[PDB]
Design a protein around this ligand. Structure first.
Ligand SMILES: *[C@@H]1O[C@H](CO)[C@@H](O[C@@H]2O[C@H](CO)[C@@H](O[C@@H]3O[C@H](CO)[C@@H](O)[C@H](O)[C@@H]3O)[C@H](O)[C@H]2NC(C)=O)[C@H](O)[C@H]1NC(C)=O
Ligand SMILES: *[C@@H]1O[C@H](CO)[C@@H](O[C@@H]2O[C@H](CO)[C@@H](O)[C@H](O)[C@H]2NC(C)=O)[C@H](O)[C@H]1NC(C)=O
Lengths: 55, 172
């Protein structure tokens, strides 16, 4: 279905690369390349769905 | 409670004792007055303190908690997510409702003990010179001034001094 002009879509995937591992991307059409990597801290962070004003 | 002083052999309680939780009321040759007994009003408040303090520290700090509300129908993985939490919840609620119910019953019975404790502290001091009427009241069997009432309440009564005076009033 039509959305913002288009009826095409993109489907989003992820892949984690471990230290010492290696990424290898391979395609012959339809790739939405990444540009780099996000860092991966891991700790007590999280998300909430509110509507209440921050004070 | 268990010991059956409060709401028991002590008809009811003094709404006009405002410096303590347990105490004495006299009628003597010199008139009519009242004092709190502190030692016992402390030890009753001191357990409740600990007890409260014990009930409190305690706060669930973990760990990236799972999502709990849901904006789709997803069947199984969700069905579990909810049932995990739904179940947990019922547990704590019980876990709670038991604690309060338990604690109280005890808080109520320990405060009762403290009274009966102070009743028997007195009884043993007045070794022979009085008799329990059973409404939480003694009938001392001699003449006792404000200086002798206040000497009973501050631990320093001397059964032997008013001994002879006591026995004649009882028996003859
Ligand atoms: C296959 O059929 C579907 C519909 O079943 C087609 O999608 C429809 O495409 C039309 C033509 O662009 C869309 O019309 C648009 O209407 C919006 C209304 O707000 C307006 O902004 C535009 O001016 C435009 O005319 C329509 O939205 C869309 N329908 C649905 C349900 O998404 C599709 O084009 C067909 N594809 C092929 C290859 O035949
Ligand atoms: C606890 O209170 C009593 C009752 O009033 C106090 O009695 C005094 O005791 C001394 C002898 O120990 C006497 O000089 C007087 O009869 C009392 N003085 C006053 C001002 O009332 C007493 O201070 C306390 N008991 C003890 C053993 O220290």
């Amino acid at each position: 279905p039509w959305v913002r002009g288009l009826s095409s879509r993109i489907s989003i995937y992820w892949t984690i690369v471990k230290p010492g591992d290696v990424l290898v991307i391979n395609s012959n059409g339809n790739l939405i390349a990444p540009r780099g990597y996000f860092k991966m801290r891991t700790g007590k962070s999280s998300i909430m769905r509110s509507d209440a004003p921050i004070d | 409670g268990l010991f059956g002083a409060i709401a028991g052999f002590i008809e009811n309680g003094w709404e006009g004792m405002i410096d303590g939780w347990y105490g004495f009321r006299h009628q003597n040759s010199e008139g009519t007055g009242q004092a709190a007994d502190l030692k016992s009003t402390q030890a009753a408040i001191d357990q409740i303190n600990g007890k409260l303090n014990r009930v409190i520290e305690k706060t669930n700090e973990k760990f990236h908690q799972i999502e709990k509300e849901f904006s789709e129908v997803e069947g199984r993985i969700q069905d579990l997510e909810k049932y995990v939490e739904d179940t947990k919840i019922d547990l704590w609620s019980y876990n709670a409702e038991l604690l309060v119910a338990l604690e109280n019953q005890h808080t109520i019975d320990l405060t009762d003990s403290e009274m009966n404790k102070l009743f028997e502290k007195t009884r043993r001091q007045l070794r022979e010179n009085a008799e329990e009427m059973g409404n939480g009241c003694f009938k001392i069997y001699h003449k006792c001034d404000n200086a002798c009432i206040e000497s009973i309440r501050n631990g320093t009564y001397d059964h032997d001094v008013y001994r002879d005076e006591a026995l004649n009033n009882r028996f003859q």
